[PDB]
Amino acid sequence: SKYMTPMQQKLNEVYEAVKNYTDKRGRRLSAIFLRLPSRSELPDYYLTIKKPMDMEKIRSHMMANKYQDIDSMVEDFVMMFNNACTYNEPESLIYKDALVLHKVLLETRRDLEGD
Ligand SMILES: CCc1n[nH]c2oc(=O)c3ccccc3c12
C-alpha cells in the first residue's frame, strides 16, 4: 500500500524528472506547466487548442493509477508540449522551455528502457 509496483515507480520517476528539472541557473522549467489558467484568463488557448493538458492533469491521472504503461504518460506530456509550441511563438520562452522539457522526458524514458 505504501509500496508502488515497478510500473508505478517508473511512471513516478518520469513525472518527477520533468517536474524537478532545473536549468544551469536553477530555474525550474516546469513552473508554468503545472496548472493551466482558466478560460477567462487564457481564452485564445482554449479557443485554439483541441485537447488542453497540464501537469496537474497528468499527476491526477497517475495518482488514480490510470496509466497502464509509460507510453500513455509520455503521450500526454508530448501533447502538452506540442500545445505549448502551437499556442506560443518559437521566439517565446514558454516555447523554448517546452522543447527542453520534451528532451528531458524522452531522455528519461530512454535512460529507463532497461528498467
Ligand atoms: C500562460 C500559461 C500557458 N501559456 N501557453 C501554455 O501552453 C501550455 O501548453 C500550457 C500547459 C500547462 C500550463 C500552462 C500552459 C500555457
H helix count then E strand count, the chain: 5, 0
5 and 104 in contact (C-beta within 8 Å)?
A: no
Q: Which residue has the cell 524522452?
A: 106
Whole-angstrom distance, CA of residue 38 vs CA of residue 35: 9
Q: How many residues does this entry show for the chain?
A: 115
Taking the C-alpha atoms of residue 29 and residue 93, their distance in angstroms, rounded to an integer, is 10
Signed CA dihedral, 113, 15, 30, 85: sign only: positive
User: Ligand 1 mean position to 98 CA, how many Å?
Assistant: 9
CATH number reported for the structural domain that contains residue 80 in this entry: 1.20.920.10
> Sign of the CA dihedral 81, 107, 8, 114?
positive
User: Looking at ligand 1, which residue's alpha carbon is closest to its atom 5?
Assistant: 84
Calculate how far, in angstroms, residue 21's C-alpha sits from the geometric centre of ligand 1: 17
Sign of CA dihedral 40, 42, 47, 50: negative
DSSP state of 5: P
- Which helix (H) or strand (E) covers residue 6, if one does? helix 6-20
For the chain, how many structural domains are there in total?
1
The range of the structural domain enclosing residue 32 comes to 1-115
Half-sphere exposure at residue 89, Cβ-oriented, CA atoms within 13 angstroms: 2
Contacts of 67 (CB under 8 A, 6+ apart): 11, 61, 73
Q: Resolution of the coordinates in A?
A: 1.7
Ligand 1: residues with CB < 6 A are: 32-33, 36-37, 42, 45, 54, 80, 83-84, 87-88, 94
Atom 6 of ligand 1 has which residue's CA nearest to it? Answer: 84
